[PDB]
């Protein structure tokens, strides 16, 4: 420990550990304070907590007649905290999450349009109203969107004979020409508009099995105003009966430039499927997380093992089994939503070098999290409170300024501002 070879001037015996004392040698607490030194002149300018912004978690005191403004709801408390941090000394604080009953929900429906979803397409014709009706049990303000995708329109993923370039399928099969991504409907609350417009889409097809929905997910994530995302909870339903292309597959096609994570819509068409590689899983993780997109993988039985693995790599996702005729999507969505919304997962931002976080969770039934699990609580039903013990240390004095890193539950725009101020100078 600090008992061995360690001796310097002033602001260095300070930043050496918890124990090391110096009377105005740098060895221990219960050894320097065990030997003759007056606890008057001894130096210890230790670290403090200081809660600055802290609106109370909204309780339901005003009863069932209060239809509460989304902007009044407060799920996470504190909101702005200043933490004064000394070296080696953790400065821990608790954070209270409470699940509100009612929050506006944007849901985008992104679907495979290759020929095996012809059956599926014909069921989705009526989905707009039946899903609006259902979702409204859960939310007072629901908006719906629809987008389609098939594939990259290049050798070798589609066949490029002039015939198949216009009808990628057989003689009888009336497939439209292949496309990458089409925004059929940006977010509306007119579920019937969904119904008409979805029933005007024509089914397509392509060559290789896995499709290019990853090109699509990215655009849906990053083309804010063109999709119509409001700063509410955002659901992307991604439904398909095939696997997925991802970064690296683009090489085969000559595409070698990695996806830029930028919007490239024109007349509601992704234009650059020729030019950019499919995004990597990591890339999506970034842009989805950063755009608060909770993903619902609605995939068929035969691709469960895969999309389950995908699900574990995408924070704030969920997976469920789609029937071949897509008859069961609504239940799927509901189920996916319920599990999504009944588990909170806490994420922080970029720390600076000599600064580390630790998490401890305390959920219902006395189930307590630790380590990576310190930031998860599940089984949270409406109104439930959970707490988090967030614990931050430091090694030595880096930036003699401050860091405004935010702690945030994934899916929610609600944040917790945490201001670090490092104590370096002598006293």
């Amino acid at each position: 420990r600090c008992l061995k070879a360690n001796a310097k001037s002033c602001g260095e015996c300070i930043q050496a550990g918890p124990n090391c004392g110096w009377c105005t040698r740098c060895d221990d607490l219960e050894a320097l304070k065990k030997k003759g030194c007056p606890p008057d002149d001894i130096e210890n300018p230790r670290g403090s907590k200081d809660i600055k912004k802290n609106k109370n978690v909204t309780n339901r005191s005003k009863g069932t007649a209060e239809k509460l403004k989304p902007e009044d709801i407060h799920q996470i408390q504190p909101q702005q905290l200043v933490l004064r941090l000394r070296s080696g000394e953790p400065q821990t604080f608790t954070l209270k999450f409470k699940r509100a009953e009612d929050y506006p929900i944007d849901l985008y429906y992104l679907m495979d349009l290759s020929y095996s979803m012809k059956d599926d397409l014909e069921n989705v014709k009526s989905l707009g109203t039946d899903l609006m009706n259902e979702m409204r049990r859960i939310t007072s303000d629901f908006r719906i969107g629809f987008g389609s995708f098939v594939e990259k329109t290049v050798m070798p993923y589609i066949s490029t004979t002039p015939a198949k370039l216009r009808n990628p399928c057989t003689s009888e099969q009336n497939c439209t020409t292949p496309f990458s991504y089409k925004n059929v409907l940006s977010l509306t609350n007119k579920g019937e508009v969904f119904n008409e417009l979805v029933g005007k889409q024509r089914i397509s097809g392509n060559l290789d099995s896995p499709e290019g929905g990853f090109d699509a997910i990215m655009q849906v994530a990053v083309c804010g105003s063109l999709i119509g995302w409001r700063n509410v909870t955002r659901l992307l339903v991604f439904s398909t009966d095939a696997g997925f292309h991802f970064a690296g597959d683009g090489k085969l096609g000559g595409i070698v430039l990695p996806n830029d994570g930028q919007c490239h819509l024109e007349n509601n068409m992704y234009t650059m499927s020729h030019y950019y590689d499919y995004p990597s899983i990591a890339h999506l993780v970034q842009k989805l997380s950063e755009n608060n997109i909770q993903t619902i993988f609605a995939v068929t039985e035969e691709f469960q093992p895969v999309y389950k693995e995908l699900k574990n790599l995408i924070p704030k996702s969920a997976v469920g089994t789609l029937s071949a005729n897509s008859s069961n999507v609504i239940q799927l969505i509901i189920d996916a939503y319920n599990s999504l919304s009944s588990e909170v997962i806490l994420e922080n931002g970029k720390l600076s070098e000599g600064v580390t976080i630790s998490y401890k969770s305390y959920c219902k039934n006395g189930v307590n999290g630790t380590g990576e699990n310190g930031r998860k609580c599940s089984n949270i039903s409406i109104g439930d409170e959970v707490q988090f013990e967030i614990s931050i240390t430091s090694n030595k004095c880096p930036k003699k300024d401050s860091d405004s890193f935010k702690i945030r539950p994934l899916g929610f725009t609600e944040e917790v501002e945490v201001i670090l101020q490092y104590i370096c100078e002598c006293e």
Partner: antibody, heavy 118, light 113 residues
Framework: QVHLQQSGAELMKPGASVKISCKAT????????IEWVKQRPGHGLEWLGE????????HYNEKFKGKATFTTDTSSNTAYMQLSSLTSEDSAVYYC???????????WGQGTSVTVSS | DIVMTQATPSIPVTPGESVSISCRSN???????????LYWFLQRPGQSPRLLIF???NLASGVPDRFSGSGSGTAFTLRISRVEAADVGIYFC?????????FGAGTKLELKR
């Protein structure tokens, strides 16, 4: 399988007081208000009050202040209503149900008839 | 506070015909939400009330497409498309905006013969 099971039929004498129970299963008890409604044959339905199990939040219909008292037991997922100073006005069937601000009274109890006769 | 009027006490209807049932409110149930808070319940004889319509227009689960609800800000109607024997009962409206919550005295619905 969301279910509200209410206590059996009760025979009372004028001036007495009675406590009806409503046991909730199939959902987390502390997530929903329990709603209390009175039905007399000839006056239809009448909202009495609502209470939030975990809290101590009640909203009474003033007409019934000092007639109906609301309590819950979180450990046995049961809502209770107490009717006191029973008269012939209090003889009815009494329903508990369930509500959130956005979605009111989807599931109901089977009802409990309170008869006030000497 | 808020008064719900269901003027018609009962409506005899030949099975197969459609019916509108109306409810009025002395105050607009329209919230600043855009959500208007009127509910519809049906009580089959000797059974408890069942939710049919929530927030003016939306159907409760298990409720057939035959049932449809719409309305002004103060005048609302429930339309049943093909009245069966199972739709016989008392139809109550309910306001869920102001304490205390108020039902209209319901309208009974019976078969013509």
């Amino acid at each position: 399988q969301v279910h509200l099971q209410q206590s059996g039929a009760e025979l009372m004498k004028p001036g007495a007081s009675v406590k009806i129970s409503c046991k909730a299963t199939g959902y987390t008890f502390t997530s929903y208000w329990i709603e209390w409604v009175k039905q007399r044959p000839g006056h239809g339905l009448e909202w009495l009050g609502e209470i939030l199990p975990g809290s101590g939040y009640i909203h009474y219909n003033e007409k019934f202040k000092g007639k109906a008292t609301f309590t819950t037991d979180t450990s046995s997922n049961t809502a209770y209503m107490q009717l006191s100073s029973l008269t012939s006005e209090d003889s009815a069937v009494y329903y508990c149900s369930r509500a959130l601000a956005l979605y009111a009274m989807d599931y109901w109890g089977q009802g409990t008839s309170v008869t006030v006769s000497s | 506070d808020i008064v719900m009027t269901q003027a018609t006490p009962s409506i005899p209807v030949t099975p197969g015909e459609s019916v509108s049932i109306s409810c009025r409110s002395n105050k607009s149930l329209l919230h600043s939400n855009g959500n208007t808070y009127l509910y519809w319940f049906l009580q089959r004889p000797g059974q408890s009330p069942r939710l049919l319509i929530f927030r003016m227009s939306n159907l409760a689960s298990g409720v057939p497409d035959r049932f449809s609800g719409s309305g002004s800000g103060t005048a609302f109607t429930l339309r049943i498309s093909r009245v069966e024997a199972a739709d016989v009962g008392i139809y109550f409206c309910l306001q869920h905006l102001e304490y205390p919550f108020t039902f209209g005295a319901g309208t009974k619905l019976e078969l013509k013969r």
